Amino acid sequence: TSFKIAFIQARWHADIVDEARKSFVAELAAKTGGSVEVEIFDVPGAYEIPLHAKTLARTGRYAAIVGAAFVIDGGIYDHDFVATAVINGMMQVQLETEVPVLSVVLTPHHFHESKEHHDFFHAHFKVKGVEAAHAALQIVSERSRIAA
Amino acid sequence: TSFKIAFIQARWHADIVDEARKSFVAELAAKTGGSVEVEIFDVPGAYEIPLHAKTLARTGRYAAIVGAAFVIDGGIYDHDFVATAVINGMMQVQLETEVPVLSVVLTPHHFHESKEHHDFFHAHFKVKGVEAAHAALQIVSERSRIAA
Amino acid sequence: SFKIAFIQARWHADIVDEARKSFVAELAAKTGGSVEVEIFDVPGAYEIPLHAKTLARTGRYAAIVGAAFVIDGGIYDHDFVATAVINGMMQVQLETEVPVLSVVLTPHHFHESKEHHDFFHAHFKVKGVEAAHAALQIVSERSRIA
Amino acid sequence: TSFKIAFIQARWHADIVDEARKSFVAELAAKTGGSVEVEIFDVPGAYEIPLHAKTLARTGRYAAIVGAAFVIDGGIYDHDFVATAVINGMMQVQLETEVPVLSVVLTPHHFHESKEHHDFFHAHFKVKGVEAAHAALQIVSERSRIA
Amino acid sequence: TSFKIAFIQARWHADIVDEARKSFVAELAAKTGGSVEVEIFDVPGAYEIPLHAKTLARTGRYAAIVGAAFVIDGGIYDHDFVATAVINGMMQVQLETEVPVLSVVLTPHHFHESKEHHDFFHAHFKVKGVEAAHAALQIVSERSRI
């Protein structure tokens, strides 16, 4: 099984999001040896992920795309508007291009800084990165059956 | 009569989602004898369901598709964004392909683990599986009356 | 002289029925019978948008009505469906250009008993009459600006 | 500085919505003399506004469309679903037909009747009607400059 | 590199929004010398931003578009409906025209006037303006690579 995966990661709070990418790339290598290679693409924020996924999806080069970002909802500013536009936009792109788009765009409830939490979120994203790899593998596999 | 149904089930919490598939298949068999056959498709999570339904729908092979997942909203992480993208997504796929997509993608309010609840949710999903079979049958039948 | 497709969900049929009954009657009173209504049953609210689109695509109807009772509240979040449906109906009408009227009602968190049951039956009877006046009015208004 | 505007007003609570239309038409008259004429169209409720706007927009006759309605959210019944379909629907229509659609579809938080409030809302809508006219003029003008 | 950016600012509360445009233009000049020029467009409210973005995007002239508005959610009137149509609308536009659209459409939680807050919001918008500039540059660059 040989295919490429585009992983789009937002850079706001890159220290957290990076945990997921590292985790994701690792597991993928463990589980496939290296016959599945992952190309990384940086993007300013979550809001730039959908158009980037659509562009990349359109190239025909990837079997799946992952968009990861940490969207901290809460503070003086309402941020859920963005999270909604982004998760919905990703759904829209995959329905339109027919390339699976997996989401590692996490939105905590109203977390609130400190080595207390910082370690919580770093742990959590490491986990979600592993899960993401398992899903990516599984959905690619499953689609190539379902269409044969 | 005779036609096929694709049943897409998400694997996160499979132990609960399974109850719905079992019950759905069963009732379908009882009520039709066997003239309506159900093909099962696995998928990592809820978010993977819309594109899978669109791909399966576009094959012409099914009179109806059922998407079933358990989306536990609540915890440190906001999970409603995904439930929304998925329930809206399924709606969008059926409108675009014109193959009915029924939902058994359930989102409890903020359930909280323990043989207490676990039996509640296993029960509820078994029921929703039966209702879903009656719904599937009734909608396919009703559409073929309109249509012609 | 024209047809109206009335799509009614069957979950809680006892309540939705009030609306249809009411709708049909008023429609007969106000027009005589030159506007006929065809009824379509559907398992739940979620089945209404595709049904509306299919019917709207036939060219037979001047307007479609989707009626259902979507009880939001309980251990399960139900607003996701209410949302997909009301939005879906808007989407259908924008795409097909046949008016779709909504009698898809979502109470706040009603809670059973002859107390409420009579409340909701009354309310749906009213909404059904309003719905008929609306259907007549919009069909009429569109044929002018058309 | 001479064009037409379609004003779509919902009739539920017409007593309130009407304030907005009156005010809108007046200000438009004052600020333009009369070279900008407004055609009014009635519609049952807010839910009927997007398809009407699409139809009217697609005629080519109007430089802008205004949908106005009062959507009372709150009571035993959840009403926000409709407000969302409508405000989103108007956005969709303008994106698709490229004729500006301005919103005077107002949703108070959970107002609660009485000469107390009735005068509040009548006032507010008269205000939003004026603002709407300024907006209308400004956006039509701005578009004809840039593309 | 050398390309143009359309900056669409809403005029309601212009005193605050302006802070962001000022800041955005500056940082862009600082960081690029002047090889990247910004064209400003005024619009009544936030709700007028997506169509404007779409029209400007369709001209071919711009590498990116920025929409900036202050949407004060809260008061007797629900305002989130608009915020939602606008941010979703901008996302839609960029998906359809494929010209990046950046958002500086901010909605505070329920701020409440006074030199106390006024300076808070003016400060915050100045900051988001700088960030927007860095984002604009970065996404234009990154797209021309892929």
The whole-angstrom separation of Cα C110 and Cα E61 is 55
Order of strands, sheet of C35-42, starting from the edge strand that comes earlier in the sequence: C35-42, C2-9, C63-69, C100-105
Resolution in A: 2.7
Contacts B129 to C, Cβ<8 Å: none
- The reply to whether CATH 3.40.50.360 applies to domain D1-147 is no
**Exposure pattern of D77-100 as b/e (b: 16+ CB <10 Å)?**
bbbbbbbbbbbbbbbbbbbebebb
Count chain A–chain B contacts defined by CB atoms under 8 A: 74
Residue D17 Cα, gap to closest chain C Cα (Å)? 17
H helix count then E strand count, chain C: 4, 4
Phi-psi region of C32 (alpha: psi -120 to 50; beta: other; left: phi over 0): left
Please give the biggest Cα pair distance in chain A.
Answer: 52
Q: What share of chain D is helix, strand, coil (3-state, %, to 5)?
A: 55, 20, 25
Cα–chain center distance at A147:
25
For the domain with range A1-148, which CATH number is right: 3.40.50.960, 3.50.50.60, 3.90.870.30, 3.40.190.10?
3.40.50.960
State whether residue B107 is helix, strand or coil.
coil
Contact between A4 and A38 (Cβ < 8 Å): yes
C19: number of Cβ within 10 Å: 28
Q: Under an 8 Å CB criterion, which residues of B touch A?
A: 41-45, 47-48, 50-52, 54-56, 75-78, 81-82, 84-86, 88-89, 92-93
CA B51, E83, E99: angle at the middle one, nearest 5? 60
Q: According to DSSP H, which parts of A1-148 are helical?
A: 14-32, 49-58, 80-97, 115-146
Touching E (3+ Cβ pairs <8 A), the chains are A, D
Q: How many CA atoms lie within 13 A of E125 on its CB side?
A: 27
Distance, CA of C74 to CA of C121 (rounded, Å): 21
Q: Which residues of C touch B (CB under 8 A)?
A: 40-44, 46-47, 49-51, 53-55, 58, 74-77, 80-81, 83-85, 87-88, 91-92
- Which amino acid, one-letter code, is at D138? Q
Cα R_g (chain E), whole angstroms: 15
Q: Does chain C touch chain B (at least 3 C-beta pairs within 8 Å)?
A: yes
Which residue, among A22, A74, A68, has the nearest Cα to A45 in the 3D structure? A68
- Collapsing DSSP to helix, strand or coil, E21 comes out as helix
Say which residue the tokens 């190309």 belong to.
A39
Point out which residues pair with A102 in neighbouring strands: A66
Instruction: Name the experimental technique.
Output: X-ray
E41: tokens are 């467009």
Residue range E1-146 forms a domain whose CATH class is alpha beta
What are the φ/ψ torsions at residue E73 (nearest 5 degrees)?
-90, 135
